[PDB]
Write an enzyme that holds these catalytic residues in place. Sequence first.
Site: not given
Lengths: 481, 359, 481, 359, 77
Positions: A56, A89-90, A349
């Site tokens: 992240d 976020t990247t 998940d």
Amino acid sequence: EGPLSVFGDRSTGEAIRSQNVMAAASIANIVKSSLGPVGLDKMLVDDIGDVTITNDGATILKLLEVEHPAAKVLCELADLQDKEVGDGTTSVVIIAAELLKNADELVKQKIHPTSVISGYRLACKEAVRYISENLIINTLGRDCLINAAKTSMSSKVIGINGDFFANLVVDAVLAIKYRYPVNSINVLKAHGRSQMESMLINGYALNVGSQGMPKRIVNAKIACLDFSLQKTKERIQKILATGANVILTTGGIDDMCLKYFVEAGAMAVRRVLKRDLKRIAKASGATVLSTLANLEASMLGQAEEVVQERICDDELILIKNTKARTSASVILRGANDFMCDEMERSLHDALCVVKRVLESKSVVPGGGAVEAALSIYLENYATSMGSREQLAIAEFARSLPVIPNTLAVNAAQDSTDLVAKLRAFHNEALKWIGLDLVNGKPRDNKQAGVFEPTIVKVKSLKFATEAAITILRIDDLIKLH
Amino acid sequence: VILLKEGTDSSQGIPQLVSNISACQVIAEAVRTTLGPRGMDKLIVDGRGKATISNDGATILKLLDVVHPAAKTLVDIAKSQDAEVGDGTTSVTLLAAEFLKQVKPYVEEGLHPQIIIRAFRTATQLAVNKIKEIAVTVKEQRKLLEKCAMTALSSKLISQQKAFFAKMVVDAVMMLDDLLQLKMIGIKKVQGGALEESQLVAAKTCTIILRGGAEQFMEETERSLHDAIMIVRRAIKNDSVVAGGGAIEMELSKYLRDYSRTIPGKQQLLIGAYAKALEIIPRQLCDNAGFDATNILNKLRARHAQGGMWYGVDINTEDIADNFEAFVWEPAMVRINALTAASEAACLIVSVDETIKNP
Amino acid sequence: VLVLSQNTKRESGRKVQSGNINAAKTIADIIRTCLGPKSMMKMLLDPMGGIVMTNDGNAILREIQVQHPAAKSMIEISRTQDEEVGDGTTSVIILAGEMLSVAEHFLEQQMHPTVVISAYRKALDDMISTLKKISIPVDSNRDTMLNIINSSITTKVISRWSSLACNIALDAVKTVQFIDIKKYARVEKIPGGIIEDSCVLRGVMINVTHPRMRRYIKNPRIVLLDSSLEYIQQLCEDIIQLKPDVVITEKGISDLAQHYLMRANITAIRRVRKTDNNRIARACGARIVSRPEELREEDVGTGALLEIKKIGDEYFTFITECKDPKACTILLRGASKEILSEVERNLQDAMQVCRNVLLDPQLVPGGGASEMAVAHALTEKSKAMTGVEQWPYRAVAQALEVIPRTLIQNCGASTIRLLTSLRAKHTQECETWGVNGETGTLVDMKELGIWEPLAVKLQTYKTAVETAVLLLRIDDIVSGH
Amino acid sequence: IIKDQDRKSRLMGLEALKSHIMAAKAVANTMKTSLGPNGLDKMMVDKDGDVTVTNDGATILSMMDVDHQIAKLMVELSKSQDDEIGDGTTGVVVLAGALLEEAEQLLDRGIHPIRIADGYEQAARIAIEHLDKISDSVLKNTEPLIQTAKTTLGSKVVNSCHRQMAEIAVNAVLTVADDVDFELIKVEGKVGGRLEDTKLIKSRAVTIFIRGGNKMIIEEAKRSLHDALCVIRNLIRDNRVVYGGGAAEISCALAVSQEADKCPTLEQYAMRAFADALEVIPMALAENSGMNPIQTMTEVRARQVKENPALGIDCLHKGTNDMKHQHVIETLIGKKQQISLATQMVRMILKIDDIRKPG
Amino acid sequence: VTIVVRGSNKLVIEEAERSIHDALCVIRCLVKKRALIAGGGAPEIELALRLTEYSRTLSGMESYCIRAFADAMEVIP
């Protein structure tokens, strides 16, 4: 008079603005590698020597020792991008950097940043509009989800029957869906038989206390008692007075107290994990009373059915059909114990991915599909703007095909080519066209399960653009030490 | 480990590309100023003190001592354009360089050279096509030749007496026009008096007798005429005429980018560059006047994609303007060859993998 | 100007990958020559005066003060390898480093790690499948079960007293087997005598507050107590009313409380480590309680022999013969603390291999026999996969051949020659053929009596491969001054 | 790399621009020191040993060893200034450099060179146009003719007998005034007697027999006479005359600015920057005289708006004074020419951004 | 006079207080001069023009000076 003092770093001309861009470039490029399902994690070792492997951007930027102030900007963005929409976020960082690299181009053309700033502000806002108009609104809709849930089970030992489990997720979700509470699915594992027998309970699954009390209770009145029933007949009379047929004591129940429950025909389970009791207070809505002297008939939860089934031939209390359907259980069965652990984590998940898709109906095809469209639509918008603004918006559209351009690089899927085929197929097969690193070809994400909430995008560009605006608006900065 | 001769500078792979591409780019920049009706004449000076003043690219590139082989190719491109079209020698020189400026961003990344040539080659093809499917053909119409004879002389020093000269030109050409051979019209510069005395000693075969106060208003005038004879001639030989002012460049540059979104793969991005390169013409056109290239360039594309294939750049006024109504027409061949020579040639520049030199 | 901190290094692309590998490949060429019965013990010298001359890669990597993280991870590899099957600690380091040397070979041809890893991972499973596909099941049986624990204890400072140590682990592991948990083998070492004085105690051991109290109890009903008996009479009456006879106090007991419990014939043991209270509650079944006012006749456990013996003038309490002696205590004897921690490990590692003969007694012929067959097998799979990955598969397989290569190397004979002849007879007469360091010629291991438990080689491949992953993934390593 | 053989310098943009600004502005400030009546002579000493002490610029730039290309141009303005009207040969040189000192600043504003020509040229024209307005149109008026011949013979080694020389020059031009032509008036000096013995041999032809002491003294009388034959021929060919002393330059400099206001666009700053340069001349006068160029200038400007553009600078009385009344007039063609040569010349400078220096 | 500014957060209150401060300063200027000039470089070019004309009529070294004093105003616009 002197320009400044011994403590006052002054940056002017290309010297300042440039060094700021590079810093943003360096930073962005860093986290750029960990972009996509094929992300390349980084080993961060700060001062003391710790080692935190992460993928992240935020986490990385919040641990990365940056010197240049402007570079710290992308850190604030990744921070905001994480506490608002999380994922992506990247992306925000990378894009922001690109917007600059392209901004300078115009800058090299003796184009005062200010002008360029305008282009990004108008382009971004316009870009957001295209969002609230290309919102692939999911159907609770099956089909779609099944595919997504199937992408979460794959690449695992469960991938063999991933399909069967893909449905269990869709069902468990569509059942307790209102906002999808992931903490409402009680996934109980228990080695036994093949993973193909794994089923979904209509309620909770507790892995009677006395072979005398009723094994099945219709409209159950769960009475969650905190304190145990061990030093006697007077405490059993208080529970029988409220009409509590199902007693859930957290502590052990005295042998005598148990004999009295059989006499009153009340099913009570002793020693119930603190975590279980809490789930019962959320399901049937049973109040958790510590002392047995404060339990009233108004503190009893309602469970339309609380029977003890022999799952895989084991004794389990299935307190299902509770008043609050916001509680369910997915009996996960697997050969070994170690196997149930993995399949279980896979279920978690899947529950999360399905949730996301269900939250914010307006969703879009990721894989770069969106960015691509924005690259084409914004390009035209630049043409119908004239003046410097054109190049501004234009380049802005050239800084969008980066997301997919990078994704390919992370899969040996030659960028220049796929990035192109992505465009040609984007305006030929419609918006639902992105890059699928799996088969290395423009695939229909909207049909593959790849989705992203409308808001997620909106905020990224709104954060990336603005952040760059305040930067370009910095032609000369003097910060002492 | 002597594997190279004495004083031999030879680079390999990607690097050789950079050096060669750079050399060509900077060389074209020199003659890039002479472009436009208000170019900047250069006063080259050999090693013997001979100072020469010329505005022609070829004349310049043939007087500059070039040691770098890559830079020599440009002189060849200037000689092929000077003996095949005449004027514009600078255009092909600068254009060929620009293309190299658009490939560079790919070569410095990894894009294989040959793969680049394939696109460029394909690009030139498509480009020329549109030039032979939108060109104009009107008319020995002394009414149309004179009008264009005044618009040609304009923007130069003979724009003051463009009225007279424009006539002598149309007449000189109207007499010998089986296809008008520029070798049948003898021009005689005679520095002396005023440009208002000049006459055209005509049947067939004439001798434009010129007279100007000084060789400055004598030569600067003459040159402006030679142009009117270059344009009026074409419209009579090859009716093929295209919009000037960098208009064509702007249209092709547009559609070429459209063929990018369509043609996926390597070509898409490159074909787009091949277009971005065709923006150099109208770009430098404004710079050679004093107006911001960005504003006009961006303005042009808009007014171009929202107008037609005639909207060029009226440098005289520094603003977009329909060339079809501004009577700004040039022979279609001029462009037809420009694309050819410049492009294909430039390709080879990046095709030449490494160069072996000696002492 | 300064993007990431000031005075910091920065690699990228061909610089990050290259360095990461070589670093690991290098640290491998340091102990590689220490593999085999002909190894070469190195003599490290820490900045204190301790000259450690060992042959075990682990102890060697734990001494060599490392700086580069890449190499540090290698130390973790040996820290995980020696913590499982002990020996082979070097083997894994050699392979892990080799897999990289061949990997980089593809990093030059330009083959993104992803495409690489995927193969290495899928190949990792290949070896495993092959291992269990060609391994022979060797019988628990105290007879063979001993020859399995022995072959491991051999060639060690404990080898002298292997026989005794073997039985120690034999009895220990044969008792904690219900799935054999190694977290129930409480080892206790006391200075004095030789390694031949060792033994196995069936019960927890503590390290009689009154000289008149019961020194031994027939049917001890222990009562785990944490609180103190200091300020006493009432506190000592709430315990005696639980029918006890031995009170294990965690804190100190008052003199008064010593007379009252002695008055009722109850052996009180004050000041007992917290760790001891947890081992008595799991072997004797006595619930640990805080204050005495909470001590009932239910928290009282039960033993079958609580005798206080002077293990070297140090009267240690022996609460053996517990109802559920699932947690035995191995008393290790050693001349010093050096021969005590050494012998302790050899015993522990021995317990593991034995923990396999009772759960999955699979073993493969040493001499590299396993590595070869797998290498020969994986090679087959390569042709059954084709594609660019067809080469990588072979690469890894040809990377497993290092074990036998480096094996015959430390012998003197030709490494290449032996290799050719190896694969030869190895491709004909099964996998029963391995390298013989004593004869310098390939000999049938199976017939020579050379076999290594599958698990031993199981962890090997798993670790080595997984290692190459986390390393290959390392995209960038910044964070500096 | 070495793309060109190291034997031909090549400056880039501001690199060459700046080199010319200084150079042409330098050699300019060289002649300014010798402008006006109180001009400071120069001593040219070639590689032979022949000392050359003169005031005229053309005679100074001719002996001056000039390799700089830009400087060569400045030598052709003064040279062409002496072959046409003669007088005020230094003016054009000083004025030219002035137009550079002003242009440069504009260039600092980013004002492209080419564009700079706009104002300079647009203003120059109106400048010469304002001269045709404030010009005096005299009549075979033997009076005004001889008066002008004396003003062209003043302050020279023939001012002691400018009365006789004026008569000889007026008759020589009037006899060939068929429409006069300076090709029918030959000269011829000869040692013996004095300067008072100068006669006029007769008449579409006139032989001027000049007598004087040394050979040098005669050469100056012949030189002052030559310029006297040019000035008289200028007025007779153009009934236009103005007033020197500065008055003129002050009138224009004022008109230009005003006009610069009525005209928007960048051409505004240019014109203004052009007018301000029209002050360097009057300023130079008060300079070479001994008065403060700043105080005088402004003093003359205030008195120039109160008494029309007929008042200039009296370098002999130290202060403002009407040139007309003081009989300080010059041919119109002179000023009309001066502005041209200098200006046009300057236009070339900005149009040159390369140079291939020989050695 | 006291103006009690209320706001959920200090951020919104900080803006209120600051913005108000200006609203006060402006009324203060308006009272000290009931006039008002149009910004945007209008008064600058306004002066720059008249000043350039003022020089040409004032004479003295002041002329040049004043002109530069007028051109020095073009900076704002």
